[PDB]
Amino acid sequence: SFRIEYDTFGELKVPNDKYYGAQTVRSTMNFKIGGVTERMPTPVIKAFGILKRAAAEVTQDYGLDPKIANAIMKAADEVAEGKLNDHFPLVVWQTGSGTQTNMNVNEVISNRAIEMLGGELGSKIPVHPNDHVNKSQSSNDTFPTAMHIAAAIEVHEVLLPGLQKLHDALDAKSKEFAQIIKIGRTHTQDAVPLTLGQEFSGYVQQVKYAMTRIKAAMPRIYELAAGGTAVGTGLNTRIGFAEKVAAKVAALTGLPFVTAPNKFEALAAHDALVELSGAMNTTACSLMKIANDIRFLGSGPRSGLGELILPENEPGSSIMPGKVNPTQCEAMTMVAAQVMGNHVAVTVGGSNGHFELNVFKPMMIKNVLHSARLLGDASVSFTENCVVGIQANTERINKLMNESLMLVTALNPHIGYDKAAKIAKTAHKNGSTLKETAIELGYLTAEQFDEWVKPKDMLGPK
Amino acid sequence: SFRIEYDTFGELKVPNDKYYGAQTVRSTMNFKIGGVTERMPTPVIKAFGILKRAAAEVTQDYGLDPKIANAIMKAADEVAEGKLNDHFPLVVWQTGSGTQTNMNVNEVISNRAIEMLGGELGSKIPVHPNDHVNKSQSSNDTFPTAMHIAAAIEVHEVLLPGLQKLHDALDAKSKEFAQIIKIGRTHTQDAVPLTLGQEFSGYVQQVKYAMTRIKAAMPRIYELAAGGTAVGTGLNTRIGFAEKVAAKVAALTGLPFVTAPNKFEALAAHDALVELSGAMNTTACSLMKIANDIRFLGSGPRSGLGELILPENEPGSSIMPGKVNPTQCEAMTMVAAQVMGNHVAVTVGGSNGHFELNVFKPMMIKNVLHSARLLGDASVSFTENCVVGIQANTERINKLMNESLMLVTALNPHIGYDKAAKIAKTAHKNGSTLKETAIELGYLTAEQFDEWVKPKDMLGPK
Amino acid sequence: SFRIEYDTFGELKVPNDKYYGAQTVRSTMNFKIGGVTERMPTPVIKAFGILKRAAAEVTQDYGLDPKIANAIMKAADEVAEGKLNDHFPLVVWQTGSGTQTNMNVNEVISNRAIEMLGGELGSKIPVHPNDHVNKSQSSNDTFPTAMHIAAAIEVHEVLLPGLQKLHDALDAKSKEFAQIIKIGRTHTQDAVPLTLGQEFSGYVQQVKYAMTRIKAAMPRIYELAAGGTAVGTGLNTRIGFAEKVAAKVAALTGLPFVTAPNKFEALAAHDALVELSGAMNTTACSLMKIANDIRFLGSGPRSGLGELILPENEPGSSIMPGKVNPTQCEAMTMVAAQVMGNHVAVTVGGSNGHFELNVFKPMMIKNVLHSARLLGDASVSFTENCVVGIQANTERINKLMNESLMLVTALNPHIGYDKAAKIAKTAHKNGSTLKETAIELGYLTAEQFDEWVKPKDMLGPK
Amino acid sequence: SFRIEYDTFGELKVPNDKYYGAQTVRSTMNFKIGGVTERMPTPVIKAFGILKRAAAEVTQDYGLDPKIANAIMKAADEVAEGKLNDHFPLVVWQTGSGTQTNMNVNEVISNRAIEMLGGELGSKIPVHPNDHVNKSQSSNDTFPTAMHIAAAIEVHEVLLPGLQKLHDALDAKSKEFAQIIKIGRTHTQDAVPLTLGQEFSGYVQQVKYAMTRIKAAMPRIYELAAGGTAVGTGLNTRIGFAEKVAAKVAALTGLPFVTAPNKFEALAAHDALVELSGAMNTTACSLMKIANDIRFLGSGPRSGLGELILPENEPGSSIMPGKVNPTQCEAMTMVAAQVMGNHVAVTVGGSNGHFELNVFKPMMIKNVLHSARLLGDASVSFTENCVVGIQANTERINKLMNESLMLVTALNPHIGYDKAAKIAKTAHKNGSTLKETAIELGYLTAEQFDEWVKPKDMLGPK
DSSP states (O other): OEEEEEETTEEEEEETTOOOOHHHHHHHHHOOOSOGGGBOOHHHHHHHHHHHHHHHHHHGGGTOOHHHHHHHHHHHHHHHTTSOGGGOOOBSSSOTTOHHHHHHHHHHHHHHHHHHTTOOTTSOOSSOIIIIITTTOOHHHHHHHHHHHHHHHHIIIIIHHHHHHHHHHHHHHHHHTTTOEEEEEETTEEEEEEEHHHHHHHHHHHHHHHHHHHHHTOTTTTEEOTTOTTTSSOTTSOTTHHHHHHHHHHHHHSSOOEEOSOHHHHHHOOHHHHHHHHHHHHHHHHHHHHHHHHHHHTOBSSSSOOOEEOOOOSOOOTTSTTOOOOHHHHHHHHHHHHHHHHHHHHHHHHHOOBTTBOOOHHHHHHHHHHHHHHHHHHHHHHHHTTGGGOEEOHHHHHHHHHHOSGGGGGGHHHHOHHHHHHHHHHHHHHTOOHHHHHHHTTSOOHHHHHHHOOGGGSSSOO | OEEEEEETTEEEEEETTOOOOHHHHHHHHHOOOSOGGGBOOHHHHHHHHHHHHHHHHHHGGGTOOHHHHHHHHHHHHHHHTTSOGGGOOOBSSSOTTOHHHHHHHHHHHHHHHHHHTTOOTTSOOSSOIIIIITTTOOHHHHHHHHHHHHHHHHIIIIIHHHHHHHHHHHHHHHHHTTTOEEEEEETTEEEEEEEHHHHHHHHHHHHHHHHHHHHHTOTTTTEEOTTOTTTSSOTTSOTTHHHHHHHHHHHHHSSOOEEOSOHHHHHHOOHHHHHHHHHHHHHHHHHHHHHHHHHHHTOBSSSSOOOEEOOOOSOOOTTSTTOOOOHHHHHHHHHHHHHHHHHHHHHHHHHOOBTTBOOOHHHHHHHHHHHHHHHHHHHHHHHHTTGGGOEEOHHHHHHHHHHOSGGGGGGHHHHOHHHHHHHHHHHHHHTOOHHHHHHHTTSOOHHHHHHHOOGGGSSSOO | OEEEEEETTEEEEEETTOOOOHHHHHHHHHOOOSOGGGBOOHHHHHHHHHHHHHHHHHHGGGTOOHHHHHHHHHHHHHHHTTSSGGGOOOBSSSOTTOHHHHHHHHHHHHHHHHHHTTOOTTSOOSOOIIIIITTTOOTTTHHHHHHHHHHHHHIIIIIHHHHHHHHHHHHHHHHHTTTOEEEEEETTEEEEEEEHHHHHHHHHHHHHHHHHHHHHTOTTTSEEOTTOTTTSSOTTSOTTHHHHHHHHHHHHHTSOOEEOSOHHHHHHOOHHHHHHHHHHHHHHHHHHHHHHHHHHHTOOSSSSOOOEEOOOOSOOOTTSTTOOOOHHHHHHHHHHHHHHHHHHHHHHHHHTOBTTBOOOHHHHHHHHHHHHHHHHHHHHHHHHHTGGGOEEOHHHHHHHHHHOSGGGGGGHHHHOHHHHHHHHHHHHHHTOOHHHHHHHTTSSOHHHHHHHOOGGGSSSOO | OEEEEEETTEEEEEETTOOOOHHHHHHHHHOOOSOGGGBOOHHHHHHHHHHHHHHHHHHGGGTOOHHHHHHHHHHHHHHHTTSSGGGOOOBSSSOTTOHHHHHHHHHHHHHHHHHHTTOOTTSOOSOOIIIIITTTOOTTTHHHHHHHHHHHHHIIIIIHHHHHHHHHHHHHHHHHTTTOEEEEEETTEEEEEEEHHHHHHHHHHHHHHHHHHHHHTOTTTSEEOTTOTTTSSOTTSOTTHHHHHHHHHHHHHTSOOEEOSOHHHHHHOOHHHHHHHHHHHHHHHHHHHHHHHHHHHTOOSSSSOOOEEOOOOSOOOTTSTTOOOOHHHHHHHHHHHHHHHHHHHHHHHHHTOBTTBOOOHHHHHHHHHHHHHHHHHHHHHHHHHTGGGOEEOHHHHHHHHHHOSGGGGGGHHHHOHHHHHHHHHHHHHHTOOHHHHHHHTTSSOHHHHHHHOOGGGSSSOO
């Protein structure tokens, strides 16, 4: 079943079980680009719910009937709470201001509010999509507001909590591995030792700094454009509206949202999203290093490095013992690469503003939310299904410590540099160890080697 | 209702109305990254259907029971034809080889084939996911095969047909506008004239070259990895299998698919996808120019350039006549920016292969298919909802031709350079036209101006 | 005219008039990639001079002879001061750790110090390149230190000062234009009014936030790797060296350098350079918008927007009055594009660390310094040669204000929406002004139009 | 030591020993962005010399005095031959059309030709920079021509020859290693065997396809804009000039240059440079994989993979036998990252054309030439200083083959899967070899293992 609505181009059938109206149906026909995977991110829709709630509450002061305003606030809450996601079928690839989604939100909130008040759907009575739900608003300043509400909420609920879990798990392994001495690798060549915990402490620092970098990129995300209306002047709205809407959004979300000090910078550009994307771009570089390292450190069982034993996430064959594919490392490094491409997409859009309005908004916030969700989700997955279950192959690590040529410099003050190079060059030529060689040349006894060559003493300055 | 299946980690409930098995259910739990918008692109799933059809038909030669092989072929066809899309819930962000989706396809095809043969779902009887559906195959060589089948089909059915429509529509407008002389713009400054059709012929050429560039990037997309098995050697398969599978895929699709001459290059890298993405990256640069030009040429109605009258796609207010937002230009330019970011994502993944296997496959093909779909769909939308309806504002174009200072050089051979600069500098100072100025200074009569100053003669070399 | 020096691989001719030695000559033979334009950036060389000056003063505590330490310090000062630039022929495309430039610096300082002490160039007497100039230092922790010193100096001396000049000049113009009312543009379509000062105040905010973002990306640039030695443990350096050399660098530069609290994160990755590049990538988006807007606002003289008169710095043609190509806008927007590409280069390198050492260091700092130099210099050139001299074309702005159809809404309270719309639709049809039209229809008097239509009242909330 | 020249803005001191004139000096004052490393690439300057040589010979048909044309041609030849490089001080960051370098070339050629004719430098007598050297040319269609000439020459002289050397050296090693069997790596985990020759044959295919991709991106580079004049119409040039100058360039260079069939597409965009950059971006992905693989395959000597012995070009430490940093791999992988960033820079510029002229030309060709030079030079250096000298560590490969758990499947037909798996799980547990284990359990004899386990039979289909 369907109802009949009209726009300036013709009549449109609107499904009776849908709260959107003719303007949304027209948008689904004029913007058939990409399919359902391209739908406007739900976080933006929910952020509009919060936003329309705050606006309706403020415009009450300016005459808006409380019976209507309260119905708008109730319907807005349902959008914010994810109760009406099925009534937003529009894709990212619409107008660059996000007008169609703003209209989508206005139509859904009015028809739902109309229903709450016993009215007829599609009639704009008593709740009018533009005169009431969009009162004192514009697509140009509401969509940017929704972008920053959505990004802030995603950062604080998904991105940062995910990185925190990865940080804590990496820190636990650093402490767990504090006593395991292994051979370092510089240029991928054997190098002087360090503890597996020291190496992991570097990953911990990178994730710690990743969270600091994301937080340092949030202050200007908290600035809201609501109040600039069409070009940033605030024409057709009341003094104090901008500040009151921001304070209301801050109270509803619990986050320190504020009104943008300059609404022209807030409409004509989205450099804060470029900034936030850049912090996630750095995070991706950090997580690419961490994941690839763990990937190669777990390589083996015999023709790789074999320092780490990663948990199984795929069925391991009985005839292939010890073989574990680093599946989560692969998901994480693919996510990292994706974030890097998304950042360039954000950068191109952020650079192409025209005069009073940047009209790349939907694609910029899509890429920002995409990266934040992937990094957060991937961090959790990488933590629970890999990091927490990493074990050290101490037997193989200690074996390659005894077989390494790197510890020969510990003999320098006892038998001389030249005699040390002879042990090194000889063991290298013969393929044996340093101790077996040093003994068979008569340079020292086995008990002298054990006393002179101590890797535990090669882990810091003196 | 659900059935019980097991993997090496525990028992799993499998919905009875689903054809996938325990391995897929385990993948949905171990790879909760991004949500439903991150599901493996349907074109890859359908390409697996084609692929599993071709393999089952070839392995018949190697003993596979025809009753089983025919059931696999029937089930494979249903996947290829899009009849079973609801049985593939896995996201791009899985293992870098695409193993989980290969398992997803093998489970769905066996359970469906089992159903066709009157067996019990989840039993692997008589159709075994690995021994029968995955016979002589590996995730390492089947997923690359599916990537290239999907990319080729998308290029030929979506991308190129969309660009062809945009090309034809731009060509029609070039011919329609062949006689409309306007002022050129270099550095955005007024310049010598050219026809609106000449300017549009440049857009036509860019789209024509875009199609040539995409086609020139397809020869190596037609190379299929099927037959390299785990590392490219073709271990555990029969001589001629690689060629027969490729010829079968070519026959099923109607496209010139061939087996990759070097299976190690086909598994260890995906430089063909980087190549194809680069051609779409060029296309995006072309379409960014075309769309932004049309955007600015339609700016107005009075404080812009106002050369073009774009069709309305949003409701136009009665009190705002002549104001038309270039909505499709904004969708197209956002798509262009997205393609540029996707290309970088493809580039990072394509560069990070390790030894015998590049394990960034799902994210690379996702970004490739994303760009191809968006460019194709956006081309159609931009054509039908903007280009075909563009009109020239001949009145405003001709008015600015009479008011332009650029045509003064046509007077050079008649009244001298110095006398021409006087008319120019005077009209510029006074804000009048060249004809009104040239007359009031007594340099020539109105009938001499009309005869000497002819823009139709300023459109080519002499 | 050469001297003969020796390394382990044989004989090498060194020009008598160069201070570098055999190792540098060896490096020039094995890394002939790109030519002179690819030489290691001078700021990196100067930063090395600061570092070697700092180390030499600190290592006197370890027995370094004061007479030699004093000569090393004097020669290091000459390097830091840009006096020995012709003695560094190595390209960026060398060892990924920068070891060879470290050896280049050690040899130049050693031979210059030898010269000051009356010794023979190339003898290593009395100043040894490794035992004295490289004392307590590693071939892995010195280059990361140098590039952070160089990055910090370039930010504070070039990048921020350049952005500060641009901020101030834009702010002065924002005030000079605070009363010039123009027609706003959204989607490039005519929109409600705003002043040039308001529009320019958005540019000012963008530059102010750019400087904030760059400063917010510096805290981890000030962390120095010096002391981590080969793999980050500090093996074979002295306790307290790390903190002492960093404090000496801070005192020599007046910048808050400190030792890196985790040397493994400091050697294995350069996320700080990625962070700083990201800040400059956001800045480039801001400058692209500003420069491109001023570009189009100055378009004309007659077939463009024509709101701004940009300074003419290059030669015009007397026959072309009014035609000024915005060449400073082109240099700026080209620089912005370069910074965006540079950022991807930095991102790829930063993502590809391996275990204990990221070996993409030279190319990472090269792109960071390149972007910082271009942004800083372009901001000065754009300021001095364009912004400070921008003039408003008030005569044309006033004409376009009077001819705009946007102000028609001011008549709504006085003659009703229905009648205002009739005026706009008629003015649009006849190509006349709102005032002329509203009078011919007889809906108001000329004195009534001037009293009701006041753009000065349409510039903010009420 | 200066001379005094004059432009419309006053007096300018020109060094007596320079051939450039007032306009060039003016350009050096207004565009002080970046310094000498940012000077216009020399290949662009040489290409201008070819172009001006071609134009001068053709314009004799238009009355150009042969005695002057001959001097222009001789001076243009000196520019093309790299003999007047010190007379071009302008940076890339100039007018987006490259006009000032065009004037730089016109002044240098004019003053050098004046000198050859016994005239006074700076007098424009008898050789005028614009009336003679720039005859029949525009300030907009000359730079696009020059940068396509430069791009084509650099591809054919530097890029492809470098890739050809790398292809050939990799192919020779593929054959030298055709019988050395090693353990394959998928996901970095141990996998079924393949030969080093097979693995290397993949690298060979990648380079072969890279050269194909680059050549496939050239056809539209050979299209020259010369003749389109200011906006593409060819106004104020002669019929036949476009086709004649292009054929003269083709004859002078031996490359298939032709006039662009659509001069509007040729001036308004540089999609061909984006296409060519994309080809080099694919090449960079290929070289990253090859260089990084060889990097890790040479990792060791003992705590890495250790399959390859790379040539040692820099100084080792006698105490560190076997430690060879893969420095050529680092220069190559850094170059690859740079090319990827360069491509985004080219992409952003190529996307930002405006109507009749893309004014990002200098930065676009700079990045194209930069990538082509680095790729070509790095391929030669990587070839001569690494690839040709790579040796296989056959002793270690054989040891790791015998210690691998991967070959255990060869025992399946002889003792059954159940028993083979028992051997693998035991060898893995005890850390012993398959042979040792299979004997202690008594499942076979040593002579039986050698007859059944033949890796030479596991290298292809059957």
